Design a protein around this ligand. Structure first.
Ligand code: SF4
Ligand code: NA
Length: 344
DNA sequence: AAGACGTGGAC
DNA sequence: GTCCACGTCT
């Protein structure tokens, strides 16, 4: 019944489509950036980041040529920072290998870092009209209600089932519009809770509504880590930071020196981490910071720093007015904030 | 397969 | 407290 379905979905879309910033044009670069930013991140949160990011890096080439530190800083606070290291890498490769043109072949484009099945579909259909599915969580939710698919939406193969369904119902005339429309329906009408089935423009075609189970779809099925953080300052008030490893948690961001302590043993694991002279005073605060897959229980220890050799390794001696120029995870921004108000 | 990988806001 | 939030790499 796809031909009817298309027109009713596309009609609704033409009326209800939000004028979001990345919807101003179909520049493949602007689309790509916005899709990367929208991964596991709400639209309202993304809007200001996208505007500043495009301000700072207006073209794919501008992004490619920026220092990675300048690119992390722009992403500071968005979460899932490797999304941006991959985008930065993929863009550099588009500039050098594809002459600054986002490739329109699905196979070539998917080879770029951070680009998976969803982003292939999203970017190529909207920028170039390539008829590839663009199944995200919204689409998965819509399709699961529309076709009463009770497969655990977390299973790897489940998406592949949804992608097949898109290939056979999609408006091959206008794939971008169609894909866009399906996503917008998930966002505006067919929502995680209390979907507005009474208002929905494809309600006639929907098995979950007919069966009375829209609400129960889709079907879908964390460790605590103590952290001791050191805030060490000069008599000149310069502060000691360090750049995290290029791999693992919060890759490449800056932080106040810290280590995992396993419980509340002491402030010695901290002081020991030498390699220059430090003595630490009583801790001033403890608060916790949540990630998707773990929770840091931080305890910050103010302390005095004395110089006994060069600062190297990933460590850097930062004057206070310059902290603002580095990218810190939110947890460490709070470390600085609590330390500063304590200093009152 | 299924875990690593940030964050904020509705409820 | 839970869910959003399959997105992608591993
Ligand atoms: S009818 Fe209700 S459930 Fe079916 S698609 Fe429209 S909103 Fe989703
Ligand atoms: Na890829």
């Amino acid at each position: 019944p796809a031909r009817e379905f298309q027109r009713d979905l596309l009609d609704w879309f033409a009326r209800e489509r939000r004028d979001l910033p990345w919807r101003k044009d179909r520049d493949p670069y602007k689309v790509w950036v916005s899709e990367v930013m929208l991964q596991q991140t709400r639209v309202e949160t993304v809007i200001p980041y996208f505007e500043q990011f495009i301000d700072r890096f207006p073209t794919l080439e501008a992004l490619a040529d920026a220092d990675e530190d300048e690119v992390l800083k722009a992403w500071e606070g968005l979460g899932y920072y490797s999304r941006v290291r991959n985008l930065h890498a993929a863009v550099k490769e588009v500039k050098t290998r594809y002459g600054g043109k986002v490739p329109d072949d699905p196979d070539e484009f998917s080879r770029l870092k951070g680009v998976g099945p969803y982003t292939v579909g999203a970017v190529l259909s909207l920028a170039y009209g390539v008829p590839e599915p663009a199944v995200d969580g919204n689409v998965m939710r819509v399709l699961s209600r529309l076709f009463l698919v009770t497969d655990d939406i977390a299973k790897c193969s489940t998406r592949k089932r949804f992608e097949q369904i898109v290939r056979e119902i999609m408006a091959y005339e206008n794939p971008g519009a169609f894909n866009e429309a399906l996503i917008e329906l998930g966002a505006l009408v067919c929502t995680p809770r209390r979907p507005s089935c009474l208002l929905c423009p494809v309600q006639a075609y929907c098995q979950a509504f007919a069966e009375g189970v829209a609400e129960e779809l889709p079907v879908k099925m964390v460790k605590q880590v103590p952290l001791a953080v050191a805030v060490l300052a000069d008599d000149e008030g310069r502060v000691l930071i360090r750049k995290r490893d290029s791999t693992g948690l919060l890759a490449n961001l800056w932080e106040f020196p810290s280590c995992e302590t396993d419980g509340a043993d002491g402030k010695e694991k901290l002081e020991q981490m030498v390699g220059l002279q430090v003595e630490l005073t009583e801790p001033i605060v403890s608060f916790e910071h949540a990630f998707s897959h773990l929770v840091w229980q931080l305890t910050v220890f103010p302390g005095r720093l004395v110089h006994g050799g060069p600062v190297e390794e990933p460590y850097r001696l930062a004057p206070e007015d310059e902290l603002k120029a580095y990218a810190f995870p939110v947890s460490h921004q709070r470390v600085w904030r609590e330390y500063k108000e304590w200093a009152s």
